[PDB]
Design a protein around this ligand. Structure first.
Ligand code: NA
Ligand code: ZN
Ligand code: ZN
Lengths: 197, 195
C-alpha cells in the first residue's frame, strides 16, 4: 500500500516463486527497478519463452521442449533401467548422481486423504511405459515417506510376475555422520535394514 | 536441461539472494505447477520495468508522477524525512509517520564515484526550496556511510532556521548489553545522551 500499483503488483507476482516470501519479494522488486532494468526484461523474456515452450516428454513425462526429453532422446543411455520418481526435480536430483538409465515421472504419490489414487499420479502411463520398453529393472525412487513407500508397494504388487526385477533405493544413515547425531528413526531403520558382509 | 529451461535458470539468478541451486528449483517448480503464474510474473515484470519512473517530488520509484505519499494532500507538510531508498520509505510508513519524504539514491561513496550529485543532493535542495518544512529528519541507515551522508546533509542545511534531527541509534531496543558487539557498545557509550 505504500508502493504505487505497478510496484505492488510486481511484489505480489514475485511471491509466486517457490521459497520467496513477502519481505524477500519486496526486496527483489525494488532491487530490479533500482539497478537492473534490463535484467528484469531478460527474466520476463525467459519466463515467457519457457512457460509457452516447455511441455512434457511423451515417454517419461518430465519437463521438455522436445517431444523426447534429453534423457529419453540420448542413445548412450541404459535401456534396461527405469527409475520411477515423483516429479521433475527428482529426475534432476537422480541425474546428479551419475545415473544413466531411463525415467518415468509420476505426479507425486498416492494420498487417500487427498483423494490421489493410481489414475491421478500416472500409474496407467507407467504401465504403458513398461509395456513399450524392454526394461530388466524398475527402480522405485519415490520419496522415503509413508506415502512414497505406499506408492512403491502399490507399483511393486501391480508389476509382480512380469519377469521384471523391482528394487527400492536404500534407506539408512546418511554419509559422513556420527551415529550419535543421526535422527533416531533413521538409525533404527538402518539397523533393521542392515545387510550381510 | 533443455535450452529454454537453462535460460530461465540463468535469468532467475539475476534475483537477489538466488544462487544456482535455488534458481534450478524455482525454474522447475514454476514449470511443474504454475505456468500461468510464470506468465503473470513476466507481464508484471515487463510492465514495471518499462513503466516505473520516479516521483517528481521525493524521487522514490513510482509509475505515477506523484507517489502515494506525495499525492496525499492530507499529510504533514512541515516534516521531511530523508532516506536512502524506497524500502526505507515503506519501513518508515509502517510506524505511522505522516510527513513527507525525500529518497536519496543510496549513500555517499566517493571511491565508487557516488558523490552529492549522484545520490540526489541537488534534488533534495530543490525539494526544500519548493516546500515549507520546519523539520528535516535524517533517516539514512546507521552505517558508516549512512552517518557520513547524514552529516553531509546536516552541514549543507545548517543556518536555515530548520530543525535538523537524526533517528535514534546505538544499542538496539530489546538488547542486553552482554550480547551486543563491543564496537556498538563503545559507540553507544561515547554517544550517551541526557535523561
Ligand atoms: Na527401507
Ligand atoms: Zn523423457
Ligand atoms: Zn513522492
Amino acid at each position: 500500500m505504500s508502493f504505487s500499483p505497478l510496484i505492488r503488483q510486481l511484489i505480489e507476482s514475485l511471491r509466486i516463486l517457490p521459497g520467496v516470501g513477502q519481505k524477500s519479494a519486496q526486496r527483489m522488486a525494488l532491487m530490479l527497478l533500482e539497478r537492473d532494468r534490463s535484467g528484469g526484461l531478460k527474466l520476463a523474456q525467459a519466463l515467457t519463452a519457457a512457460m509457452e515452450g516447455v511441455g512434457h516428454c511423451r515417454q517419461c513425462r518430465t519437463l521438455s521442449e522436445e517431444e523426447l526429453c534429453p534423457q529419453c532422446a540420448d542413445p548412450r543411455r541404459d535401456d534396461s533401467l527405469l527409475c520411477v520418481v515423483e516429479g521433475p526435480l527428482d529426475v534432476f536430483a537422480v541425474e546428479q548422481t551419475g545415473y544413466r538409465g531411463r525415467y518415468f515421472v509420476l505426479k507425486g504419490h498416492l494420498s487417500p486423504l487427498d483423494g490421489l489414487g493410481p489414475e491421478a499420479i500416472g500409474i496407467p502411463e507407467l504401465e504403458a511405459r513398461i509395456r513399450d520398453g524392454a526394461f530388466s529393472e524398475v527402480i522405485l525412487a519415490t520419496n522415503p515417506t509413508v506415502e512414497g513407500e505406499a506408492t512403491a508397494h502399490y507399483i511393486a504388487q501391480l508389476l509382480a510376475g512380469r519377469g521384471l526385477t523391482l528394487s527400492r533405493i536404500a534407506h539408512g544413515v546418511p554419509l559422513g555422520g556420527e551415529l550419535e547425531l543421526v535422527d533416531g528413526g533413521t538409525l533404527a531403520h538402518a539397523l533393521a535394514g542392515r545387510r550381510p558382509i
